[PDB]
Amino acid sequence: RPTFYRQELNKTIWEVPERYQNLSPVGSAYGSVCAAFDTKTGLRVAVKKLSRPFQSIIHAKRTYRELRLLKHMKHENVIGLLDVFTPARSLEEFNDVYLVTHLMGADLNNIVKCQKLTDDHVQFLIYQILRGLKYIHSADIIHRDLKPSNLAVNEDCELKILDFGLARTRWYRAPEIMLNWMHYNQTVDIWSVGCIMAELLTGRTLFPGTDHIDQLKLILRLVGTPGAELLKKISSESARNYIQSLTQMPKMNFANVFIGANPLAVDLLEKMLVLDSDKRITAAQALAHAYFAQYHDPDDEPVADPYDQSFESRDLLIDEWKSLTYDEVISFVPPP
Ligand SMILES: COc1ccc(OC)c(CCC(=O)Nc2cc(-c3sc(NNc4ccccc4)nc3-c3ccc(F)cc3)ccn2)c1
Ligand SMILES: CCCCCCCCO[C@@H]1O[C@H](CO)[C@@H](O)[C@H](O)[C@H]1O
Ligand SMILES: CCCCCCCCO[C@@H]1O[C@H](CO)[C@@H](O)[C@H](O)[C@H]1O
Ligand SMILES: CCCCCCCCO[C@@H]1O[C@H](CO)[C@@H](O)[C@H](O)[C@H]1O
Fold first, then answer.
1. So which residues are the catalytic ones?
2. Does 32 appear as a known binding residue?
3. Ligand 1, atom 10: nearest CA belongs to which residue?
4. Which residues contact 57 (CB under 8 A, 6 or more apart)?
5. Which residues line ligand 3 at a C-beta cut-off of 6 Å?
6. Which domain holds residue 151?
7. Residue 142's domain is classified under what CATH number?
């Protein structure tokens, strides 16, 4: 229906509706990105042209997964889809997929710049992360790689959780992920929030490991070696015997680690940075914590519609994944 124009960008021919003006390259894995001006909405937007979206079953399923996820995320603190389009007029000529979202200019690293933030500022940032995480977790989604480069912040200081980094590490990963534990709790993301929050308060990386083993060494020095109740839950005979062969490190007193911080911030960090994932605070519980008193609104922390992820178990042909992807493009409804 819209009128499309062609322009060579990022060494390929882009073909976009005329509403998207002044395409300029932003960078080029999954695809190449341009910034543009959406004349229909007056928004600066980023347009991603997926690369080789249906070259293989793996590519095709990944394309479907990404479009399904972006179409489902409708929350102020999560990246959302402004538009998705293809120049194709039919399924038969469907080969290219373009995704459109708000143009973001800064991630959390750009806002922090290795500085201590004010406590009020930390409250506001962590509150928004937890608000978005409550939504994501309510859809039975685990982020699994939350970190400052995956958190965008606009000029109003509204934060959005991304599943990508902007155009130009393991320091924020939960310990069970670095041990390939599987059976991951949604609180692997809460661990990451604790690492981020600590960094916002101190201006320093909490666990700046040099490699995988160093990362775990640094974690255990803060939170201690596994206690008795955690050791009961370790089925791996190899993990058990190695853990008990280590000298016991006590859990440090967080009040004497984050000296000068808000005692409520310290209490919340103590509830996020627990080795046992079953004992970590959830996102919804964290939002009710006294630390966020000035921002918490129990009636404006919404949850997601149910999210059907049954396609993850399916082994389909390329043309089937492509057809399901085409259905999702055709059915897309722009947000208000
Ligand atoms: C024109 O003003 C700017 C001036 C300077 C400048 O820095 C060079 C930037 C860059 C800011 C930026 O990168 N902004 C941005 C990116 C995305 C991304 S980044 C990605 N993948 N990662 C990836 C891809 C290629 C290269 C590096 C990293 N995907 C999407 C994305 C995801 C879904 C969509 F629907 C659309 C785009 C989304 C929104 N804003 C801008
Ligand atoms: C001059 C720089 C680009 C300006 C905006 C082009 C906007 C296209 O906008 C679209 O144009 C279509 C054709 O008129 C109309 O049918 C649509 O209603 C209108 O939204
Ligand atoms: C768009 C929604 C962002 C918040 C939800 C992230 C949900 C988990 O999204 C993650 O995205 C990564 C992208 O490389 C994938 O590699 C991971 O497998 C996936 O779990
Ligand atoms: C030296 C061992 C260091 C890491 C101990 C990490 C314990 C994380 O916690 C564990 O996470 C598992 C996976 O979600 C859950 O199934 C367990 O019940 C939970 O206790």
1. 163
2. yes
3. 167
4. 315, 316, 317, 318, 321
5. 69-70, 73, 78-79, 136, 141, 143-144, 161-163
6. 108-292
7. 1.10.510.10
